[PDB]
Each structure stands twice: as C-alpha cells, then as structure tokens.
Symmetry: D3
Subunit: 300 residues, 6 copies
C-alpha cells in the first residue's frame, strides 16, 4: 500500500562539469530530472512507499528515466514509455552564480498528461498526492489533469500537497494566480518560496493571506523556512553548506517534509528533515543525486 503518489513530466538534465557559459563546454553530464521525479526518488530513498505517474518517449532517454525510477524502487504501476520523445534541458552555471536554462521539451510524451491518465483507485489509502505548479503550466490538458487529480484524491480522503514552483517560462503571473485561485481550495499542504510569493502577490505577506491553506511552508533559501500550521508559525534553519548545484533542492525540501508528515512527525522535525534533504541536494550536482537514504538519517 503506497503512502505517497506524485505525477508530472520527467526530464533529462544536461549539465557541464564546471561553471561557465554553455557555448564553451565540450562535455556534458547526463542526469534524470523533473520536479515530481526528484521528489519521488527522494522519498523512495528514505523508505517511503511512493509511486510515480507519468509518460516518457519510446527513446533511449525515456528508457534511462525508467531505469532510474525502477532502480530507486519507485512504483511505476501507472508510468510507461509511450510514443513520442522524452524532454530534456541544458543548464548553465556562471562563475559568479547567475545561471540559465534551455529547454527542449515542448510536445514531449510527458507533457501529454490529461484527465484519467491513471486509475483513480490507485490513490486508495494513499497518504498524500504531490504535484508541482510546473505540471498545469505545460498544457491545457495538464492543467485539467492536475485539477482532476487533486479532486479524485480529496474524494478518497487523500491530502493534496502542492509546490507552487512558478516558472516564468511556462506561464504569466496572472495565469499562475488564476490557477492557484482555482486550485487552492483542494490543497492541504502548500510549498512556496519567497521570490514566488513576491513575484505573484507583491509581498510575502499578501501571498500568505491569499494562499491560506491548512499548512503552508515558506522556503527562505538558506534563511531556513517557516511552517504555518495551526495559526502557529514555526521556524526552521537551513544547514550551513556550500551550494554546488542548487537545482532540485526545493523538490528535495518538499520530499523531506512529506516524509516527516507521512511519519506523523512534529513540525519541528518535519522542517528539520526538509532542510536536511534540501541541503544535501544543494551541495551535490544533478537534479536529485544528493538525496540521502534512510540509513543516513538513522546514523545522523
């Protein structure tokens, strides 16, 4: 019996070995990415029973994705390689921090996801259902799917977890607010970053009042992150580390909190766990390569 179920579009990340403009690189590292994918693996590595819903192309990259998910022990009952191609993107980290990403995923097999992409009875007995704001922003079908998904979850007593994850590349602030404004009602746990709230509601303050969900978690980068549960405002501090490749850390952060929730842990321990995973991934290259295993926590 699964505890958590996530869904979205898997992606392959192409990253240079060191900082510097892409144009000057001659070799690239291949990684398996995708917001929800990162969360899926992070959870699995911690022993949480998780399944991943999505599609990939019938190509080598799609296969690559499938192996990783399978190798990591993720439930792929409703995951499969379908006609089409698997999306990819190229990251670029500059000497002084400023990065830039180039996508090649439009019209991918994974961006198809529409209402009914999987059997609802899958969400039976499931603790949480996790989705990212990236999914609905991909297409009209994806947006519909997302809404549909969290509706069948609520109907089955499945808490809905959402990570805003606003992408300026996918949709405009209004389109994003338009969605949130519509989806918010079915959300139980909301993950939001400072910049996002700022970029969508002017200031972190308003955002919190507008997006008032049962449990909101405001990621403050290294400044830790706040947990707004029962009117209470718990604070959590990030782990002092040297940010290597900050990509995928927010997803890892989410996974740490969910695991904590799944295990019915105090808000203090849920935040602690979340910041731990976010730091590990942040201090490692790849999309989710730094994600720790249960055995690591046990030892720490």
């Amino acid at each position: 019996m699964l505890e958590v179920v996530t869904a979205g579009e898997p992606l392959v990340a192409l990253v240079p070995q060191e900082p510097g403009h892409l144009r000057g690189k001659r070799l690239l590292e291949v990684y398996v990415g995708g917001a929800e994918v990162n969360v899926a693996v992070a959870l699995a590595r911690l022993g949480v029973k998780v399944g991943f819903v999505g599609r990939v192309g019938e190509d080598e990259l799609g296969a690559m994705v499938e192996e990783r998910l399978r190798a990591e022990g993720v439930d792929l009952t409703h995951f499969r390689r379908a006609p089409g191609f698997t999306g990819l993107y190229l990251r670029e980290y500059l000497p002084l921090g400023q990065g830039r990403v180039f996508y090649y995923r439009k019209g991918s097999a994974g961006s198809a996801l529409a209402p009914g992409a999987f059997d609802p009875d899958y969400l039976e007995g499931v603790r949480f259902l996790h989705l990212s704001g990236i999914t609905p922003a991909l297409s009209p079908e994806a947006r519909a799917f997302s809404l549909w998904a969290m509706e069948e979850a609520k109907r089955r007593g499945v808490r809905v977890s959402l990570d805003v994850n606003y992408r300026q590349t996918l949709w405009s602030p209004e389109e994003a607010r338009g969605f949130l404004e519509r989806a918010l009602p079915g959300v139980d746990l909301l993950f939001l970053s400072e910049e996002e709230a700022e970029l969508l509601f002017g200031r972190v303050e308003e955002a919190l009042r507008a997006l008032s969900a049962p449990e909101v978690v405001l990621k403050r980068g290294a400044k830790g992150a706040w947990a707004f549960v029962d009117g209470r405002r718990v604070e959590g501090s990030a782990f002092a580390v040297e940010a290597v490749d900050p990509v995928g850390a927010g997803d890892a952060f989410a996974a740490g909190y969910l695991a904590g929730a799944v295990w019915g842990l105090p808000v203090e321990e849920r935040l602690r766990l979340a910041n731990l995973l976010g730091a590990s991934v942040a201090a490692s290259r790849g999309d989710h390569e730094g994600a720790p295993y249960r055995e690591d926590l046990e030892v720490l």
Copy 2:
C-alpha cells in the same frame, strides 16, 4: 571574393565517449554539426573562400556554433543568431556498428530558412553553391528557399552542387523524388550514395539514368566512389582506415571534391581529394572534427 557558398540548418551533436546504448551513458561530447556546416568548415580549413548562410537560436548553443564558424574563418555575412532555439541531436553507436539518432530540432531558428533569406548579390562571382537534400526536407519554406537559392545562382552563372543526403526521418522516398525531379534541372554537380539511389530508384542503375546531371558522384562507402563526368566513368578508391565515427564523412567527401573543382583539378585529383577528407573525418569523432587543413595536403 568568395569561391563557395553553402546554406542550411546548423546543429549541435551530442555523442557518447564510446559505443553503447545512450541510456547507459553518463557523459556526452558536444560537437557542432550540420551537413552544410561540415562542408563549410572543411573547405575553409583547406583555404577555400567560403561563406555560410543560416540562422541559429539566441541561446548558448547557437553562440557556440557562431564561434566555431568564425574561428574556422567561414564568412558569416549572412549568418546570424535570431530569436528561437538552436537545434541539437543525440547520436548512439552500438558495439556491433548499428547506430541510432535522436533529434530535437523541430521548430528551430535554423529550420526557418525561406526565399530571400540572404542577399542574392552575395552569389556574385561565386564558383559553387552547395546545398543538401536535408534543407528542403525540413519545411515548405526551406524547400522553396532551396529552389529559390539555386535559381539565383544559375542566373548569376553559379554552378549548383547538391548532395542528395536523403533522410527517411524528414520525408518519404516519393517526396524526395518529387523534389529531385523538380530541382534536377538546375543542378550541375550531384552527390549521391549507393543506398540512397537504391532506396529511391530501386537500383543504382536507374537512379543514374533518371538523375543524369552534368557531373554525378556516386559514393560507394569504402569501395571508393565513381565520377561520371563527360560520359566518362572515373573510379576512385577510399583510403584504408578504421571507421571511428562515420558521421559527417559524406559532407567531408563533398567538400574535398568541391575544393578540387574550385581548384580546377582533374577528376582523378578531385576524387583523390574527396576520399581523403571523407576518410579523415570517418577516422575521427564529431561531425567534422577530422577535416584536414591545407598545410596537411601540402605535406602529404
């Protein structure tokens, strides 16, 4: 005063360090490809005054392409980085030789090429105009452009050189025949491989009769290649070498022939030069990394 002018869509090649299925690779080599791009560089390296017409995206890969073309001394008077993205592809070489290519170029800035993409007075005094069958196969605009291009060349007394380079991925044998049957009249030099003729005209025989251009060159892989000039059938033998990454060899072959023609060399020396370039690139990784320089010929 340019001698040769080529045009088409530039591409970035992602190739693994060694043979094996893509899905198992963790690092990939970045190369600048594109049929006519390979030809452009190969000719420049030999000291031939050549210009390249085309567009790339306003991204890092498009920039990368720009530098290589500029570094190699290709005239980019009508080349530029325009809005959009630069197409790329992923090659895969299997243990026993069978390869497989994955494209990510649909809707790229380079696939735009339409009639008038450049100033015709550019072709003034130019010896040859080189185009590949890949260009017209990309889009209705590109096909129109190609036709337009060789029309403005002919009217400027510029010989038209064409390398069939049939791609099953771009169009069907009939669509290809349909094009050739239409373009053939304006072609002065035609490059064709044995498989292509067989895949489009049943047998190498018919193809040669149907596609009877002033000068046809049939590439026979390692079996050399035949030159059909003045009813005469000159034969040329390939250089004994160990095929490393056969990609881009045909383009390199064409470039060697053209240089020979540009230099008014006998058919014997044109074929010799062509097979030399084809062998060099074949015996090296990347799309055109093996192309030799003038100084190499001088010494050899």
Copy 3:
C-alpha cells in the same frame, strides 16, 4: 509466471579504462558481474521472465547489485541483502591480449548458498533452471545446493541448464570431473567451451562422449559454436566483431540460447540468437553491459 530461474554469487567487477597492468592504473570502472547475474539480466532485457536467487552483503556494493537487478526487471523474490560482504574482483587486460583476474570474494555473503536457500515452489511452472560450474566450486554448501537445486527442478518438470564454466582458481580438473560425473544425470542442456573440454577430458572428442547430455552446446570462441541435439550436429557462426572486453560473453551466449529455447525456436535460431548476445557483450566493456534488448532483435 517465471520462465527461467538462475542462481549463484553476484560480484562487482573493477576494470581499468584501457589495457595495461593494473599497478599502473589510477581509475577503475565499477561493474556488476557474476555469471548467472549476467545471464539473468541478458534474459530480462530480452523480455524473458526470469528470477535470480542469491545473496549479497549488507554493504554499498551489495546494494548496487540489488538496484541493477531490480532496475533490469529481474525477479528478486528469493534474492536479498544479508549480513556479510559483497564479493568483488579486479580485471586486467594487457596490450597483447593476455589478461589476469584478482578475487576478493572468499567468505562473502553470496558464497553461502546451501540447500534450501529458496522455496522450491518457486520453480513451479518454470521452463529452465540455469546454474554455472562456478557455484558448486565455491564451497561444500554451494556444491550441495547446486545438486539440491537441479533435483527439485527435475522433480517439478523443470529442465536443467548448466554452463560448465570451469575455474582453475576454484577447483582442480578432477574435482570438476567428479562433480560433472555426479551432476550430469540431471542436466538437460549443457554449455561447454573447447578449452574446458580439452582441459578436463584431454580432447573435445572424449568430453562430448563422456558428457553426453540431451543437448550439448560447444562454444568455439569466434569459430561459432556447435549444437548437438538429436544426434544431429548443427553448426553456428559467430558475428565478426572487434573483441573489446570478452568477459561475460559466454554467459551472454547461454542467455541467448535459453531465450531461443524458451521461445521454442529452431536450433538454427537458438544458435543465431546465442552468438548474437555473445558478440554484443564481447564488443563492450563490463560484465554484461553489451547485452541487447528485445527491441534490438525486433529491429534487426
């Protein structure tokens, strides 16, 4: 419902990037090996329902093995990480071909295998049971297990497949003959190489007469391999390829044969399939990295 079930000791292979004495290497490639492990994966890749029986240590290498087997879709119902360590070895390929292997497996968790290591009802409805002569050579428990295993298979109507795979390191020619002379009766399909037969029965002739099993397959290296079925002697030719890392090729060969048998294919096609897998793995580094997938055969 499984079709094939194999068992033995999994191993991790440490191989240098290129030829040369080990003592001069500064970096080594990590691979998951083990005769029956190679066979298991090769079959899974071809779509054959296969399960793997064995143990590994509760360490990181044992975990690594577990993921690969799981990622590849092998049934690990009776496979698990138990106390102890996972065995490993170091290969060394010299400039002129002569290699040398260094083991670090004595007393490993995988060398434990004894009678009853798994539930016999696992072999219910299974087509074949595959074992290598390496297993019984490890310890008195392993030898007993092997005998026990093929006994429970025969009583379940499960054909027994064996690959002599004689290791001078594990036991003497007499000890090996002693085993075969004892096990032979329960064997249905026997895999044997020319050197082995010669090293154990003087000449390939005698060996074939002494080891007369229902179906014997004599691997002749590149000289193909002969299939002795119904008194008939079918011949098969190997695929012309450049041997990169010949390790694991024999295991891959067996897997190709079994798949052919499982699919009820003519001896012609069984040998064809077997030589195909052997060539692929031979032409690639690692213990079973070159094994092809079903989709590759379909296309070829």
Copy 4:
C-alpha cells in the same frame, strides 16, 4: 643511517571522485594507503631518512604499493612482496559529511607480521620507531610483533612513537585498553585523538592520566592539538582549510611531529609542523597525496 622506522600493513584505497553513496558510483580512484605507509611517505617527502617494514601480496596492487614506497624514497630493506594478496578497502563520503568504509583485507599478506618480521639490527642508531594501534589489532601475531618491535627498539635506545588509532572494526575498547595497558610502559611519544580517549576512558581527562607517557599529543581535530611534555601543556592551532578528504590526516599529523622531533625542534615548532601536514592531507584526496615536500616548508 635511518632516522625513523615504521611498520604495518599497507592498503590500497578505492575512493569515488565525489561525495555520494558508493552504490551509485561508476568510477573509483585508486590510492596507496595504510597508516604507517602514510607516515613513511610523509617523512620521506620532508627529507627524513625513513624505512618501512611490511609485506604485500604477490599481485598487481602489492606491486603498486612497492613502486610508490620506492618512488617516494622509503627504505624497503625489510619490505617485500610475499605470497598472498594485498588488502584493499572502499571509502564513501556522503553529501553531509558522514562517511563509511568497507574492508577487504582479512587474511592478507600484510596482516601476517609476527615477531622477527625483520632484522633488529635495522633499528640500530634509529631515532624513532613508529607504530599504529591498527597493527596489533589485526591479529595475535601482529599484536605480538608490535610488542616485540618496541622492545627491541627500547633495547637499542630507540624512542617508541605510538598513534593509538583505535579501530572499532578491529577490536573492542577493552581489548584496546588491555593492549595499551600492557604496551604503554615502552612508549615514549603517544598520539591520541579526543574521540579515542573519550571512547576508551570516558573523558579526555582520565585517558591523559591513565595513559601518562613522557610526551602525549592530543589531536583536537580543527581545534588544533595539545602537547603535554614536561608537565607543560603547549597548545597548537590547526590551519584554516576546507576539509576535502580527511582520511590520512592524523597519520600526516604524526609524521609532521616526528620530523620536528627528529630535527630537535621546539614543541611549538613540532606542533606547527604537525598541524601543517595534517591540514595539507586533509585538504586533498587520497590517503597521503597531500603530504608536502621539504622544499615547500623551505619556501613557506
């Protein structure tokens, strides 16, 4: 005439290129390790005349060890490749610091060392004899050897230097105390870490009183280290550096102090030198790759 003589079991270290669980690595760095080996080379690099006593297997790894020791200018008068194998181990550094090591050395040629392993007249005129608590913990023979070694040294007026180096993997705290309690009398210089004293005598305090040797040096990690000589308690501060691969730093620390002693340097300069070497090795990968040369000190 040698100044310092050390002895023990040499080891080969297999380390990943970056942090992360071993199970996910595909390439490993090969290094020559072994506590006493690290000290031997560190000393040699500083111009100190040092000899190394020990055995390795008659394999490629044993050979590798021999080259390094020879290349580094260590006296191998009583070092040799003997029948058997050379031990090795695999390190693993996790994203957030927690590491884990896996050994493959039980029954190695190096763990044989017993009383009389070398000619005592070797220690004639020698300044110090260095041994680690790892040696005696290997086997009953090794423990006997160790005791025997420091006895023949004392008899020849050779100061005995000992680095507790307690390994929970080799023996229990009591077995360790049992040894120390017996060996202590012949020790002249004792190296001990905070954790060790804590793990063996409850608190750093007791340990110091129980293990009261002429000169004790308490390594405090980055907190420097204290030198307890003539009732005096000199303090030394560590060099601000980014710990890369902390392995082998304690050995390097010891070597720096010994060199200082060998050169009859003030306790302030002995500590300074020791912390210097510990920092260098700490800030570099491998077991002793960071060890500085005399020319480096000269310049600093």
Copy 5:
C-alpha cells in the same frame, strides 16, 4: 573602428586538474594564456572592439592560440603565425596555496616583437593601448617595441594603459624601475599591485609618489583596490569568492577597468567592473576562462 589595442607574447598554459606537485600529475589541462591575451579576450567578451598584436609559432599551439582569439572575436589584423615556436609554461598549485611556474618560451616566435611590428595607422581613433611590464622584460627588441608603441599611440592621441606586472623571472627590480622611470612619462593609466610597489619602491607609499601617472590603480588582492584619479582616492571592494586558480585575475581586472573607461563610466563603476572580472577569473581555472560576457553584466 577599434576601441582598444593590446600587444604581447601569447602563451599556452599547462595546468593540473587539482592541487599538488607537478611531478605527481599524469594529466594536464591546456589553456591559452598571455597577459595581454587575457585582456584582449576579456574585452571582446564584453563587446569592446579590441585588436591583438603579436606572433606565434607555425605549430599546433600557435594555431590553437589563433583559433581562440578569432573565436572570441578579437581583431587579428596584425596578429599572425610566423616561423618559430609558440611558448608555453606549466603551473603548479600546492595544497596550502604556494604555487610555482615553469616556463618554456625563451626564443619563441612571440618574444620577437620589435619596433614596427605593426602598422601605426592601426592605432588611429583607438581609445586605449594596453601593454604589460612582461613584454619589455622579454628582450631588448621587445623593450624597444613597447617604448615605440606607446610613442606612436601618444602621437595619435591614444591613451596609454600599463600594467606593471613585474616578473622577477624576466628582470631585476632595478631593470624594472629603469624601464618605468623611462616609460612613465607616456603612461596615462597605470595598474599596480601592492606587492609590486613594495618589491620595487620599498613601500606602497613611495611607489605611488614616484610613479605618479594621471590615473593609477592599486590592486590590493581581495582588499579590493584603490583608484587615484584627480588627487581623489576612490576605493573599491573585491567580491567575496573562493579563489580557485588566481592566475589571470589581474589581467581580467585591468580589462574590466578599461571597458569601464572606454564606456566613460564613473570611477566607482570602473572599479566595480574591474573587481567583477578579477573575481570571475579568480574563481575559475585557466588563464582567462572565467571572463564574463556582456550579457552577464546586463543580467546582473
């Protein structure tokens, strides 16, 4: 119309992948260096129209240099591969910071530069002419050239920019002062480091009074750098970064200031820009690999 013109000897830098004595490295990174070369590329990357005057050998390294300069968009109107060889050097970074460089450039094609090495009309309309104290120190011809160069610049209303860049390897402090004492009159902008002034004029104070040029810039390492313009003493602070490979940072620093000057920017913004480029190159390996592009500033 060019804005800035620099000249000197190009060099190829051979650097190890990590810290440690050269003697122990088995692989080296190849980079294109040369003070003035670093400045040339840095400027070009920022969109400044710059030309480079110099020679390289008719070898592969000389060719390598030419490609980079061309690829980077530097004007090579008076740059060319001439008979002779291209100089190179080998860097070595030690664990605790202390480095050491080994040169192989004496008698190189680039060290030839003498009066009239290029057409003076080249400096027509040019904003600045940049030279390093390395050039004149190479040979009597180079020293003469340098003096000659800044004379034809002044005559054409071209401001002279000079980076002391004192090399103890090339000439003695007196020879250096002898030059400065003679060249100073024609200098408009002077770049000087703290150590240099100290090593040549006793204390930073004297140096500033002796070398009183219209605009002097004192590089203080990480302590930023001071700008002495109109009697005014503007201060600038360096960007907090982890010095990777500090080589080429001073050149990058100069380039940032020049660009700022070329763009007629306030002294505050000229210093800001300079410290920015110095930090980027400092935080990256190679001679000028970290140099940012205009697009980076635009974004920051």
Copy 6:
C-alpha cells in the same frame, strides 16, 4: 654489479588521450620518455641490473623523471637533478596515422652531457654500454661525450651497443654518416631500422656493407627484424598486434635484445625477446609504459 649502463637526455612526453590535431586537445597525458630512459626501464623491469647516466633540471618534471627511474629500480649513481630545466615534447597522432612531434628541449640540463659526465670505473665489469644516435646529435659536447663514453667502455672490455635512431630534427644525413663513420669502429652491436639505412645509405643493402659491425640488427617494423651475426642472417617475426602508440617501441626492442644477449641467449631467442618488447610498447600509450616485467616472460 651492473650488467648494462645507458646514458642520454631524459624527456617528458605530453600526449593527447586520442588521435587528432594537437590544437584541438584540451587535456594531455604526461609520460616520462627519452630513448635510453625507455631502454633503462625496460631492462630493469626484466630484472637486468642497469644504471642510467644523465641529468635533468631542478624542476618538477626533472623530479618526476627521477622518481620513475628510482621506482623502476634503475641505478642512478651517476644520475642527478642539476641546475637548468628538464626537456619536454608534445606528440600528435592523426586519424590516418601520420604523426608530428614538437620539442621544447634546446638548452636543457640533460643536453649538457660532456666527456667525464661520470666516473669511468662505473663501467667496470659491465656487460654492455648502450647509447642512441640522438645523444651525439644534441650538441658538440654530447657527441664528444658519446665518443668518449664508448672509448672508456672498450678499454674496460665493455661491449658497445648503439641504436642509430637518426633524427632529421637534430642533424643532417651527412652529419650522421660523419659520426657513424667515426664511431663505427668501437661499436659491437648496432641497431638500425630500414628507413634509416635507406635515408642515410640509399638502400638497406649499402648501409649494411658500410656499417658492418660484429652484430647488426635491422628492424623491419612489423616485418620482424633480421639479425646479422656470424655472416649468418637470422630472421625474426614481429607479434601480430594493433599499434596504439608506436613511440618508444624501437627502444623497447633494443632492450629485449640486450637482455637476451646479457643472458647469453641464442640469436633466435634474442630476436624473439626483442620483438616481444617492441610489440608490447607499441600496443600501449606512453614512451615505455607497455614494457613487460620478468614475471610476464616467466609465465608466457
């Protein structure tokens, strides 16, 4: 008691990882070369007591050379690091086989060698003295030294072994003939390749008549090599292998012959041994990395 003594200039070889023009490489492999250095190591590896006479610079590369020679067990009684620099060179292997070497050795510490560079009583009881035609070609001092060296050997009853090893880069065919015509009298064993004899005496025939030494060995590349001893003409065949990096093979060949001679082996076995070493080094990268050890012969 040494058996063989060789002398010359040591060199460091910089080689790319794969074929291709140098200008396109970003990483290079570092190797220790030098004709007589290759011979010295090859012999030491075979257990032959050999000493090496020469000098290197007081730099890191000179140190590197020193370690290898010491690590390999070569007697360096008359070898040392002296003021100056250690020479190096850059190799380049093209796709189709044609290579090209770039030197950086002129005026090196090793090119100093003059008469009396070492104590003649060193050659006491020594079997052979080996020198290459590269040594005398370096400078007038080196040529004098070489003559001097073989003179002191002859007077000590030490057979003189010489490998023409003609370098077009060092001196002209006449200068080489001039030397040989002068040195020949003191030569006992002469190593010569087909191209060399042809390039110096028109045809292999004349050369053999003119250079008639007690024992001449003509290397025929892969066509084996002929041994002209007692008027007898023994023939030897090369080992079928895939030439990787043919550099240093001739030196390795000489070493195999010498060892055979030193061991008083028949001409049949001397040639067999020689071709074996030549093949091994040919089939491996570096200057002498492929040289086998005694233990390899024993086993083979």
